[PDB]
């Protein structure tokens, strides 16, 4: 046997992140502000890249999963926490988008608890 | 407000 | 400006119902074209209108007739259809609200009498 290769596969935790955690969040009513990277020019957002130096969004997390960018579920959880905290840092605490982020994070934390 | 409108973001 | 049975209906039934709808919020206040980065908005929309302005006009007895209030709704909805693409999300929101608008207006009292 010259080449004992086998097809690339995700871990059970990474498969869970994709088919359960992200699927559930993407379907949530308040997830749509998090589908794409923040466009600070289009959205007229002062100082966004000055304050938020590691941008993250669910579209990027989704695609990193579908393109096998991740090698461990912990990296995917870190991207999710970066997404939520960026939104908490930049916006005012009473802003709707923060309450939306908080609602998604609760479901995220609840789903990660259910994980193997 | 505005940011969600952009409407969500800008209240 | 007057208080009428029909304008009372527009304030206490039509606006009340529409304001609570899940898709009403983009219509709560005038479009701020500078803040939202829509630099062509006022070259395309000559007569802005929004449901917050309608609500205040009802509250300040601005209208002489519910006919004028309904025109304001028509202006708000058709401004949205003109400025935006038929597949934009805000257009589907406007269509949902206009559908409820139509069902409430159908039950408005047919004769307008001043209070």
Residue numbers in the entry:
A (entry chain B): 26 to 141
B (entry chain C): 2 to 12
C (entry chain A): 33 to 147
Which passages does the manuscript contain on this structure?
Because of the limited solubility of the original peptides, we synthesized analogs that incorporated two glutamates at both the N- and C-termini of each peptide to improve solubility and facilitate further characterization of the peptide–BD interactions. We also determined the X-ray crystal structure of BRD3–BD1 bound to 1AcK. Again, the electron density for the peptide is best modeled at 50% occupancy in the two symmetrical orientations. Furthermore, the binding pocket of one BD accommodates the AcK8 residue, whereas the other binds Tyr10 (6A inset, and S10B). Instead, the most highly selected sequences from the 1AcK screen retain five of the key binding residues (Leu7, Leu8, Leu11, Tyr12, and His13) in the same relative positions but “shift” the AcK in the C-terminal direction by one helical turn. Strikingly, 4.2A also displays two of the three leucines in the same positions (Leu7 and Leu11), with the aliphatic portion of an AcK side chain occupying the third position to pack against the WPF shelf. The direct mode of Tyr interaction with Asn116 we report here, albeit through a water-mediated hydrogen bond, has not been described before. Again, it is noteworthy that this mode of interaction with Asn116 is mirrored by the AcK in the 1AcK peptide here and also the AcK in the 4.2A cyclic peptide from (11)—raising the possibility that such interactions might occur in vivo, though most likely with lower affinity.
